[PDB]
Amino acid sequence: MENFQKVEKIGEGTYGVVYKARNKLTGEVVALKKIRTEGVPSTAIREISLLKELNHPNIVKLLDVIHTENKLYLVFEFLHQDLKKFMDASALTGIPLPLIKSYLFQLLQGLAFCHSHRVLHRDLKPQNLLINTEGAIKLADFGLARAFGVPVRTYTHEVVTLWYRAPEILLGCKYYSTAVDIWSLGCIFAEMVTRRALFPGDSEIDQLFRIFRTLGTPDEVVWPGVTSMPDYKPSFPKWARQDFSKVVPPLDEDGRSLLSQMLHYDPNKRISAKAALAHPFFQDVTKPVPHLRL
Ligand SMILES: NC(=O)c1cc([N+](=O)[O-])c(N2CCOCC2)cc1NCc1cnc(N)nc1
C-alpha cells in the first residue's frame, strides 16, 4: 500500500500475494496479505474482523483488516520461517524428537484455544505453521476458510494441497467439526517424525484411497454413518488396516498411541485438542530452540 514499504515478497498465498512490509509510521515489520471478485462480501469482512479478537501466543496475530479502495488486505504479525521450509532444511537429520514434541504441544494449545471459541482452521498444513528463533510455533490463517472458502487452485493457479484433508471432508460432509483440524495436525505430526508426507494424494480420490490403504477402508463398525456419506460409494475397494509400528517408525508407543487417536475415522471419536494435551506423550515435554539460519 502507501503506509507500508514492501520489503520483499514472502510468497504466493492461497488467496493472494503475501509481502513482508514495514509500517512506515510505527516501524513495525509485518506480513501483508492481498486477498482476491466484485466488491468483497460484507459478510466476510464482519467475520474476519471478528478474528482480531482471537489472540493467543500460538496464533499468528491479525493486526488489521483493510477494505478501502475495494480491495482486501490483512495485516499479520511476521515470523521468519514456516514449518514446510524448516522440515525441508531438516530432512537430512530430521527434527529432534524433543522439538517435534514441543511444536505439537504448542500447536495443540493453539487449537484448544481457537476451538474453545468455536473457530476452526479447516486447512492446516506445514506452510501455515510459522516459527521463530525462540522455539515458538504459531498457527496462521485460522478462520479464513470459513470467510473465503478453500479453492481448488490459488490465485496463481497452483493446486491447493489435499494431503492434510480429513476424510469426512473428502466424503462430502457439509458440516465440519473441530475434528478436521486434529486430523490435519496428526498428518503433520507423522510427517515431522518420518520426514515424508503421510498421505500425499494428487486428486481427491487418490487422497481418500491413500488414507484407506493405510488405515483400512472404513465401515459402519469403525465409523457409524459412513456408508451414508454424500460421496461414499459401495464400490470403494476394501483395504485392510496397517499396523502403526509400520506407519511412523520409529516413534515410541506414547507417540503412536496419540497419533492413532488423532487419526480415528469417526470425527466424534477423534481426540480433542484439550484431551490430547493431557496425553502421556507430553509427560516429558520441553521447549528446545531450533537451529534457525536466517
Ligand atoms: N505471517 C507471516 O510472517 C507469514 C505469512 C505467510 N503467509 O501469509 O502465507 C507465509 N507464507 C508461507 C509459505 O507460503 C508463502 C507465504 C509466511 C510467513 N512467514 C514465514 C516466512 C517468512 N519469510 C519467508 N521467506 N518464508 C516464510
Q: What span, in angstroms and rounded, lies between the C-alpha atoms of 14 and 35?
A: 9
Separation of CA 82 and ligand 1 centre (Å): 6
231 as an active site residue: the answer is: no
Nearest-CA residue for ligand 1 atom 19 is 79
Separation of CA 253 and ligand 1 centre (Å): 34
Annotated binding site: 10-18, 33, 77-79, 82, 125-128, 141
The full set of domain ranges for the chain reads: 1-80, 81-291
Catalytic choice (64, 88, 123, 284): 123
Q: Is the C-beta atom of 129 inside 6 A of ligand 1?
A: no
Query: Which CATH number fits the domain 81-291, given the four candidates 2.60.40.10, 3.30.365.10, 3.30.470.10, 1.10.510.10?
Result: 1.10.510.10
Q: At how many Å resolution was this determined?
A: 1.9
Nearest-CA residue for ligand 1 atom 12 is 127
φ, ψ (nearest 5 deg) of residue 178:
-60, -20
Q: What span, in angstroms and rounded, lies between the C-alpha atoms of 149 and 152?
A: 10
Q: Is the C-beta atom of 164 inside 6 A of ligand 1?
A: no
Contact present, 225 and 273 (Cβ < 8 Å): no
Contact present, 114 and 64 (Cβ < 8 Å): no
User: For a pocket test of ligand 1, which of 10, 62, 65, 81 has the largest count of ligand atoms closer than 8 A to its C-beta?
Assistant: 10
Contact present, 14 and 159 (Cβ < 8 Å): no
Annotated binding site for ATP: 10-18, 33, 77-79, 82, 125-128, 141
Specify the residue for cell string 493457479. Answer: 157
Nearest-CA residue for ligand 1 atom 20 is 81
Contact present, 259 and 276 (Cβ < 8 Å): no
SS (H, E, C) the chain: CCCEEEEEEEEECCCCEEEEEEECCCCCEEEEEEECCCCCCHHHHHHHHHHHHCCCCCECCEEEEECCCCCEEEEEECCCEEHHHHHHHHCCCCCCHHHHHHHHHHHHHHHHHHHHCCCCCCCCCHHHEEECCCCCEEECCCCHHHHHCCCCECCCCCECCCCCCCHHHHCCCCCCCCHHHHHHHHHHHHHHHHCCCCCCCCCHHHHHHHHHHHHCCCCCCCCCCHHHCCCCCCCCCCCCCCCHHHHCCCCCHHHHHHHHHHCCCCCCCCCCHHHHCCCHHHCCCCCCCCCCCC
What approach was used to elucidate this structure?
X-ray
Q: Is the C-beta atom of 82 inside 6 A of ligand 1?
A: yes
Domain 1-80 bears CATH identifier 3.40.50.2000: no
Q: Is the C-beta atom of 169 inside 6 A of ligand 1?
A: no
Annotated binding site for Mg(2+): 128, 141
Chain centroid, CA 90 distance in Å: 19
Is the alpha carbon torsion for 272, 144, 73, 45 positive or negative?
negative
Beta bridge partners of 66: 73
